[PDB]
């Protein structure tokens, strides 16, 4: 048989349905879900590390005359000045006044340490939305994991369960992501050579071991002093060291709907958004009729004590004269109140207590055991604490008074 | 996986400072979870434990027979590790080994060594 | 501490089992719920590899050709069927009391 | 190997004591980009093991002083951790340069250069001494491995090989040319990041208030659990008190490297 | 007794020139309260007379040291000035941690710690260092007499007497316990505080005009001598020109280390 129920999609809550035929006996379906993913295609574009400004050696003729030999190093720069290094007793200990040539050669490298300190950019687009449920249709006990894609199912003993799809389209992985020390980044992170001094892009590599980088780092050879041979060079900050000191925070603190960024598997767990929905196809064998459960008893239940709390507040007590003492299903049809369980125990001929929560002041819920219609009413005291931590077991309708 | 190798003289004179050194070859000896030993067997005795040391927080176990004259030490810089044996005599000659020791997120580390280096030979003779 | 094995040597022709048995001065149990015992295997010309520690538990490396038990200080290891490439010593070992001393070397070739 | 087949050169530093020289103990390169306060620099002299020294050139005699005579200085000084080739490993606070000397059997012999030393603290306390005892987190140290992990530079033959530098010339024989490994790379770990005091946390409707008393500079990151997330953060070294309004749906709250703690309203 | 049956201990730096190890050296307590830059330091090493020294303890060994090899270092170098049991006191200026070190036959041993030394200048003009001459006012400085006082710390045999310690356990066969006197206590006296410069008054119509002209921060105190007495406190360091109004029923004012002085409108 065919069910379509829809689950609030968050974690660590139960949530406890019933299939009920119009002539066989109810079935319980707890479904739990302990994850809920959120999983983007992540497509590679670049990386980044510091930049070191590796600088080839002078090249010196003393009353000479050089020329450059055009090589190809990422911004390589290369420059010929005239006169510095003038006479002995002035460095490079050549005989001249001018006429005296230097070569200076400066090209950008990718740190020694880019292997182990590198930020990853990232496009991200179509999330692949996915779950860990703990199930039980039936008395039985699952601890699948479920693509909520409405084309991927699983099957336990007989039954046949599908999820999703559209859990609210949603996604907080902006289209440019950038990924660095486990932190997860919304930057609008500039192309494979594009990148300028000064910002997040200066040096790009494909990947991190590729052959070839791109260097735009605003490098100027400048002109020697006289006293000692030496190469020098104006070169900007990294843009790497200027992200890093005015970058905002993470994605898992700027992050919409309660999500928990994580790491290379990018992901947004237990994001509180949007509703999974759930199609089933029970078998007849798990699905057995009224001959071995209890039936119809002369039940009467009484609310003794509510609170319409976040929480398992209420408590109802039913006072029933039933056949057998065995189990029965339990469930609300209404959003009027949430219960603990699905099973409740009867006795031959005993009572019953049944932890719920509820969120109004005056509940009339319409309560249920294995097939009667058992009805409580009553009044709720206000609660004990205005702050809490245990979230929220119930529906909230504007049912106050 | 991670080899081991021993190093050292052999024919050190009597009644001198001994010494061997022992390499982690592909390994990490800076690692917790790791202690490193050194073992000799001589003729006719049967092995024999000496001494070892933590790689992480490096503070020594010796035995207290010879706790007045041995000493085991370290190098992060050359990823070496060394033995000092003071005062020798007759019966020393025997085989060194040095060990490392598994994983050790157990108390069963103890005394469980593996993947050793072949040996070095130490004849205390003239 | 002191530690003692038996048999010195143990001949044997193929195909059967074989009993080996270890005699501990102090009880090797700990208060934690652990027997430290370890068994190396001594082949000729290398350095001594193990098949049976905790008293009772293989190794990873191992053929299930083996087992081992005990109580407190009297240990028995235990052989299923010995092949050719099992000559070689066996040693009893100790742990949890310094010094990790180490047995006398029982001698087993075909 | 390195200490048995190389040679330190002399090199031009600003300032050798006395204006300027050709200095045994010239900086080509500092790094301090990593978290505690590891520096790793590129000298003009080695490290080898004849047990741990340093080998300079003076007018082409090679000399040899012990590593426990050097001393190097950024605005505190120093701790040398060691020492492999060119390169060596300490730990140093944060300053405007840095500064190396040792003193032979006559006036003593130094090399100062401006190279921003860095402190980059680990999590959401801004510290500038590193603590006792506190929680453990993720860490890329300028490492103790002397081991080749991939990095190299390279250097030539002009009888010995030396440093492709800066500040010397390129023959014009054969650039016999080579490559030799950065020791002290930037490995990861667990270091030991400080746990700020606990928040006071006084409750109202609708409303959490949080008299907070740092012992340093703590980050504070407060959001919703909602569609609008209205994410607060900013960093805290005075005692405060700061009140946050906390609907039914939710209320995030971090102080420091403490763990995110949740709150969320009821009628 | 006084004291000839105490014994050093072994503990937990966090710093000991190579990462952390055990230290004869620890730093158990550091208090910076006082006025005029002394602290007060309580270590894991004793200070007697057999005359200045340090005995140290080592692996089971004791040791010994005088007391000019000692070095201890904030952000500047600091000074000490006395050493009595496990304390030490000295004249250290303003940082975020206190190292100390020596150094036996080729060793140096170290510990660091973070706490925060801090001067706090006496008076009105907030200083660094104090002044070769000025006014005398009153300051508590951690004093150089070691008598007992009142003040008592506690320590225990496991032969010999250690401190109840932090970074030492408890035996188990008999807690013999006893208390021995902290010197140095926070004592009162008189210390010497900057006086600034003379103000320039000019006059006006029920107005008066103040040039100041510091070497240093310095509170500026107003008030009118009414019963609204509108009073201005300032923290002035640049040359500044304040003008205030002066009425019949008064106005004084303090600038620094000054006395106050009261100024009277007419008409």
């Known amino acids: 048989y065919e069910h379509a129920t829809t689950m609030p999609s968050q974690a660590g809550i139960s949530y406890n349905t019933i299939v009920n035929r119009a002539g066989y006996a109810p079935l319980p379906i707890s479904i739990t879900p302990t994850k809920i993913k959120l999983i983007p295609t992540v497509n590679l574009e670049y990386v980044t590390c510091h930049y070191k400004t590796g600088m080839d050696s002078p090249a010196i003729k003393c009353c000479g005359s050089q020329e450059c030999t055009p090589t190809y190093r990422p911004d390589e720069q290369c420059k010929v000045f005239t006169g510095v290094y003038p006479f002995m007793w002035g460095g490079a200990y050549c005989f001249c006044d001018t006429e005296n040539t230097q070569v200076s050669k400066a090209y950008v490298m990718k740190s020694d340490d880019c292997l182990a300190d590198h930020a990853e950019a990232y496009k991200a687009h179509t999330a692949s939305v996915q779950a860990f449920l703990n199930i039980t249709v039936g008395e039985h006990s699952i601890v699948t994991t479920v693509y909520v894609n409405g084309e991927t199912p699983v099957n336990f003993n007989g039954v046949k369960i599908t999820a999703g799809p559209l859990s609210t389209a949603w996604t907080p992985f902006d289209r440019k992501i950038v990924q660095y020390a486990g932190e997860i980044y919304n930057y609008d992170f500039p192309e494979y050579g594009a990148g300028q001094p000064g910002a997040f892009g200066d040096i790009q590599s494909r990947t991190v071991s590729s052959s070839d980088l791109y260097a735009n780092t605003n490098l100027v050879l400048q002109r020697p002093k006289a006293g000692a041979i030496h190469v020098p060079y104006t070169q900007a900050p990294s843009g790497f060291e200027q992200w890093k000191k005015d970058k905002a925070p993470s994605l898992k603190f700027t992050a919409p709907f309660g999500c928990e960024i994580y790491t290379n598997p990018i992901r947004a767990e237990n994001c509180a958004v949007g509703s999974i929905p759930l199609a089933f196809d029970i078998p007849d064998a798990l699905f057995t009729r009224v001959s071995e459960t209890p039936t119809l008893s002369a039940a009467e239940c009484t609310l003794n004590e509510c609170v319409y709390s976040s929480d398992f507040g209420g408590i109802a007590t039913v006072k029933y004269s039933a056949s057998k003492s065995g189990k029965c299903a339990v469930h609300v049809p209404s959003g009027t109140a949430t219960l603990k369980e699905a099973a409740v125990e009867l006795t031959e001929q005993g009572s019953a207590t049944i932890h719920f929560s509820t969120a109004n002041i005056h509940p009339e819920f319409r309560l249920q055991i294995c097939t009667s219609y058992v009805t409580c009413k009553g009044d709720c005291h206000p609660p004990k604490d205005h702050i809490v931590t245990h979230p929220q077991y119930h529906a909230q309708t504007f049912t106050a008074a | 996986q991670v080899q081991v190798q021993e190093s050292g003289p052999g024919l050190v004179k009597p009644s001198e400072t001994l010494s061997l050194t022992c390499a982690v070859s592909?390994?990490?000896?800076?690692?917790?979870?790791?202690?490193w030993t050194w073992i000799r067997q001589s003729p006719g005795k049967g092995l024999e434990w000496l001494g070892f040391?933590?790689?992480?927080?490096?503070?020594?176990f010796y035995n207290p027979s010879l706790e007045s004259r041995v000493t085991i030490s370290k190098d992060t810089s050359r990823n070496q590790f060394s033995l000092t044996l003071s005062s020798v005599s007759a019966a020393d000659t025997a085989v060194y080994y040095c060990?490392?020791?598994?994983?050790?997120?157990?108390?069963?580390?103890?005394?469980?060594?593996?993947?050793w280096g072949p040996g070095i030979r130490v004849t205390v003779s003239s | 501490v002191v530690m003692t094995q038996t048999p010195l040597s143990l001949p044997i022709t193929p195909g059967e089992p074989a009993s080996i048995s270890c005699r501990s001065s102090?009880?090797?149990?700990?208060?934690?719920?652990?027997?430290?015992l370890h068994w190396y295997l001594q082949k000729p010309g290398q350095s001594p590899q193990l098949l049976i520690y905790?008293?009772?538990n293989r190794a990873s490396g191992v053929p299930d050709r083996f087992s081992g038990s005990g109580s407190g200080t009297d240990f028995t290891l235990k052989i299923s069927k010995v092949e050719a490439e099992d000559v070689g010593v066996y040693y009893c070992?100790?742990?949890?009391?310094?010094?990790?001393?180490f047995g006398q070397g029982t001698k087993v070739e075909i | 190997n390195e200490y048995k087949l190389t040679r330190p050169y002399m090199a031009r530093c600003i300032r050798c004591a006395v204006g300027s020289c050709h200095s045994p103990i010239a900086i080509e390169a500092v790094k301090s980009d990593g978290h505690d306060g590891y520096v790793r620099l590129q000298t003009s002299s080695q490290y080898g093991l004849d047990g741990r020294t340093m080998r300079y050139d003076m007018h082409g005699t090679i000399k040899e002083i012990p590593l426990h005579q050097v001393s190097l200085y950024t605005s505190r000084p120093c701790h040398i951790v060691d020492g492999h080739g060119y390169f060596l490993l300490a730990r140093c606070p944060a300053g405007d340069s840095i500064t190396m000397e040792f003193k032979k059997d006559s006036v003593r012999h130094s090399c100062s250069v401006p190279y921003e030393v860095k402190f980059n603290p680990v999590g959401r306390e801004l510290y500038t001494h590193p603590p006792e005892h506190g929680v453990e987190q993720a860490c890329q140290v300028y490492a103790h491995d002397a081991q080749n992990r991939g990095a190299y530079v390279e250097m030539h033959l002009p009888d010995k090989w030396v440093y492709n530098s800066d500040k010397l010339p390129k023959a014009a024989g054969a650039t016999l040319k080579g490559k030799l490994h950065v020791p002290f790379l930037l490995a990861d770990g667990k270091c030991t990041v400080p746990l700020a005091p606990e928040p006071m946390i006084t409750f109202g409707f609708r409303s959490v208030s949080l008299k907070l008393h740092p012992k340093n500079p703590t980050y504070l990151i407060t959001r919703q659990l909602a569609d609008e997330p209205h994410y607060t953060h900013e960093l805290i070294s005075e005692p405060a008190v700061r009140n946050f309004t906390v609907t039914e749906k939710g209320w995030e709250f971090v102080w420091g490297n403490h763990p995110p703690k949740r709150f969320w309203a009821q009628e | 007794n006084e004291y000839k049956l105490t014994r050093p201990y072994m503990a937990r730096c966090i710093r000991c020139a190579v990462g952390s190890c055990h230290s004869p050296i620890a730093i158990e307590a550091v208090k910076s309260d006082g006025h005029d830059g002394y602290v007060r330091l309580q270590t894991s090493s004793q200070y007697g007379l057999d005359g200045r020294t340090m005995r140290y303890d080592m692996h089971g060994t004791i040791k010994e040291i005088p007391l000019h090899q000692v070095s201890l270092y904030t952000s500047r170098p600091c000074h000490i000035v006395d050493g009595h049991g496990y304390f030490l006191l000295a004249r250290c200026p303003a940082g975020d941690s206190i190292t100390m070190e020596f150094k036996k036959d080729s060793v140096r041993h170290s510990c660091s710690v973070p706490y925060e030394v801090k001067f706090n200048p006496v008076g009105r003009e907030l200083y660094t260092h104090p002044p070769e001459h000025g006014v005398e006012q009153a300051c508590q400085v951690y004093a150089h007499d070691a008598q007992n006082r009142g003040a008592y710390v506690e320590m225990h045999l496991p032969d010999k007497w250690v401190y109840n310690s932090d970074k030492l356990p408890k035996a188990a066969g008999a807690t013999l316990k006893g208390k021995l006197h902290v010197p140095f206590l926070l004592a009162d006296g008189k210390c010497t505080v900057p006086l600034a410069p003379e103000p320039m008054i000019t006059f006006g119509f029920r107005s008066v005009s103040l040039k100041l002209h510091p070497k240093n921060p310095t509170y500026l105190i107003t008030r009118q001598l009414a019963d609204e007495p509108h009073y201005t406190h300032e923290l002035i360091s640049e040359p500044a020109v304040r003008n205030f109004t002066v009425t019949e029923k008064g106005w004084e004012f303090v600038w620094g280390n000054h006395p106050p002085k009261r100024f009277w409108a007419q008409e």
């Open positions: 060990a490392r020791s598994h994983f050790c997120s157990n108390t069963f580390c103890y005394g469980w060594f593996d993947v």
């Open positions: 905790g008293g009772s």
């Open positions: 040391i933590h790689g992480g927080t490096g503070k020594s």
């Open positions: 102090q009880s090797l149990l700990h208060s934690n719920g652990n027997t430290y």
């Open positions: 592909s390994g990490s000896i800076n690692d917790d979870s790791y202690y």
């Open positions: 070992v100790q742990a949890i009391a310094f010094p990790w001393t």
